Design a binder for this molecule. Sequence first.
Ligand SMILES: [Mn+2]
Ligand SMILES: [Mn+2]
Lengths: 536, 536
Amino acid sequence: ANEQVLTAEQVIDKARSYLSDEHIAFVEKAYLYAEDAHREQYRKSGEPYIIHPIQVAGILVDLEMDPSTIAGGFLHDVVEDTDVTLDDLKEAFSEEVAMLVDGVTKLGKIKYKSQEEQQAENHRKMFVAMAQDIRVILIKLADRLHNMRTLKHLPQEKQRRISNETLEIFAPLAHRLGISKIKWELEDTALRYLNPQQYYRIVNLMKKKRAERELYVDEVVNEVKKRVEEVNIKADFSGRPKHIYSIYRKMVLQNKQFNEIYDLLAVRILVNSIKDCYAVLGIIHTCWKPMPGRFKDYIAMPKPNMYQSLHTTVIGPKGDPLEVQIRTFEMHEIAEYGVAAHWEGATFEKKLSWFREILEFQNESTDAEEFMESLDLFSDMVYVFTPKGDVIELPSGSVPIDFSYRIHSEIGNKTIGAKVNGKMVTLDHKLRTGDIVEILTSKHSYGPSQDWVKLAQTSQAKHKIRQFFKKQRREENVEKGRELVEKEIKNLDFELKDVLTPENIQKVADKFNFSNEEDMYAAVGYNGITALQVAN
Amino acid sequence: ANEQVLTAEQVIDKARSYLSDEHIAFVEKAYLYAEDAHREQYRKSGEPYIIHPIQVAGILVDLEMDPSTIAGGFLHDVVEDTDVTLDDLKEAFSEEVAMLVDGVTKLGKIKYKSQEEQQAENHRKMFVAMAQDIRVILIKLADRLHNMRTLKHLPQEKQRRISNETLEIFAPLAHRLGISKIKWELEDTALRYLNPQQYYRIVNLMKKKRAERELYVDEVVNEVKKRVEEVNIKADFSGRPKHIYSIYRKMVLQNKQFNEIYDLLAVRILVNSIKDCYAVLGIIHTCWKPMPGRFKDYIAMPKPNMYQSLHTTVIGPKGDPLEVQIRTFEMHEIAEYGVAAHWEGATFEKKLSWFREILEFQNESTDAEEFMESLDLFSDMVYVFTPKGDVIELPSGSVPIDFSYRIHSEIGNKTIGAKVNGKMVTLDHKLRTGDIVEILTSKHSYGPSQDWVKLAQTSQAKHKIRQFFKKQRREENVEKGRELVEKEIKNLDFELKDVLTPENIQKVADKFNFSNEEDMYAAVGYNGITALQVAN
Ligand SMILES: [Mn+2]
Ligand SMILES: [Mn+2]
């Protein structure tokens, strides 16, 4: 059960799968240089020299990085391990590859610090100063990952020290950049050496219940898709296996004994848009009761490492907890491969600076690893729920009036009150995201008031209110131009015309050839003398 | 048939409908000052003095402008018409109101220019220099609108000269700012004096056919909503009456005789989102054949005056032409009341500068009033059609692979070719917006290739391709770890084990307690010696 060592041709072809011929030639020259560098110069364990740089470059290609990063990973242990120097590499390929390799070597030359967070900050500072980018950090993370994969050949004390350095520096740094695969693998492979007893205990504890958990998952997945595809929203997804080191992270927390750890490796749901995300949220909330306070909105409040999802723990099946996760495919790419997945005339000027800034804030974020509300009122769209499960979007600052007019026009016109998550609110009340809103309606009502056009936020609601008021004005002027001028014209003189009310007078009113007959009456709301002389 | 003169209390209450008490006090003080300014100082025609500023301020409130603009409209004819000077106004209220009133008066003091476009540019330059904003321009447009409304009391030559100045300067300027109501009213009321014969001819020509046109509309509206509400997308809308001066604009064009003017005052459709706009577009294209080249996308290529809609002329009912318009409610607010509808610590710094820039480009846009493709590849979402009418969104640069994977996962995996609007295209072909795409599918196919992950643009398609390749790798390693090691272990020695193939060896393979039994076979794709010794 050891994943094999890949050859160089496979890595070159997998890089060719997403690169052009020039980058392929660059990485091939780098590979040949790395081969000719350590020739007749092998490891202490007797294993060939090029296996380690080849695996580092393969892990880097697995992240699909820039060709300079892959060349540096091929040439990361060439300067101080062989006769080739830094000037040789700078003359060979470029100055940037030299910077990357020199940074990797410098971070290989580490120093002890009195404090732990301070040595983490020193490892961060070396990078940030020598490379605002992560290319050096990525190459070093690949080096450490391959070291963790081939650690069993080393003495046990060295194994434990390397695993400690990984758990205290490299794995939290990988978490800082959003690269989650490397984080999980480093954490698991470090716990395997630091505490093999707890590692295998967690493994064989997950073993017994993962069968009934697969059944729980399959059933909940089936029900979820059967109730989601009805609202005509497609979503490819699967179950999320909870990795071991997170189990130990919550396990060592004395309160969170393994039994009834409330996260129980629930299902993730990948979908196309954010509105679809919140629709799936509402559907899951309507299919099962959510546990209070167990909802986390990492979309409107993204994690500082760009993580973006939606977590909610519900009652679900027979088993009490299930913490469903919902995110989009871009959000999945981010939450999986961080900046490397994210990675214009010059696309490397603002990129590395923003990455340095996100790392300079993620240091403080790692000093307090949990929620630690960040920054905000930046989001423009709030997604509100209907009690049945439907989720509708509104501009931030929208009122329940906008909600009602978004549901239906007639439903909006006859609005009286509003209930936000079971609370009698005012129509002026602002709408947050996620809260469930239901409006009070009755056809026995005149309609809106003059204040509705002011306190509304959605343009649609304002438009419909203007339309309603204009219709009312038209009917008002028509009632005037019927009754008031039906008397005012010839109060006594039309007594015959009050006896005989024919349609020929309609025709003599049509010779004015205004827009409409209803308009023939509506114009009277302004002028009353025109039809006063043409009563003939 | 003359719309009445509104009082001051009505305008103050309508401003109160969307303002606070302080702005109401400001506009009330401005109104009282305007009343006491021209007291015992009436017009040449004998009409009271305050009617004109009151109507100007009422038109400004109808646009719901800032209180300073309404105060200036109340006080636009106070400086040079009364004893009150500019310093009096500057000491009374502020410096900004003084700037606005002085600009209005300066543009009332106009100069003749040798060229027509040059005098239009002079009228633009006076504004832009004295006010990068439109507040002065808005007050002057309201002044000119009220002058056009009360023009019948003036001599005919003065009527025609004022209407000419309106048609050559004020109406095109209102069009420059996107304010369309004022543009239409000014154009119609100017054509009424400049060419009453053609005005009333167009009126009584529209009269005869507008009945059958109302029938055509009602029927098309009914069919459209009946076929749109089925796809579960709501849209409030109505018919769009074609104003008279546009009829004359196309009529004076010798080719476009009134008969079969291809625009025939078709229906507009207001909807919530842009995706809904293009969905309505596809539905209308599937219900009736579109006329070639009669489609205009003013959403992806907005008019320089911020106009944003979607026009398409189709065959429709018995009658040959019908040019349906589709836009959102924000787009409707824009296309109706321009910048005044559009109108942060300081919200007036960038606003007026951007408005000045849009006017400095709309001058050139008015020198060539028609399409005049502007700027671009700025839009991020391309909306593609399915031949049935469904419209799906993609990121710009998406390939038909992304389209197929967006339709369905299985449909995507078995993709072979693609047809864009009836043309056999490559899967590498980039997708424009609006074109109809249909992919070729067949379950007799292995699946994607290594190039698909590269040339795809949607993250969802890349994710599904990675998943497919990983499933194939798993099954490949399982086939290996069945056959190759089923022989390689004990080629002759397991002849008994080839005779007896029981499930107890499955149990001795389960004592390794790896993840899954399928994983018990999949791990053999890397290591083949572990199960070689435990054949017992
Ligand atoms: Mn190394
Ligand atoms: Mn005036």
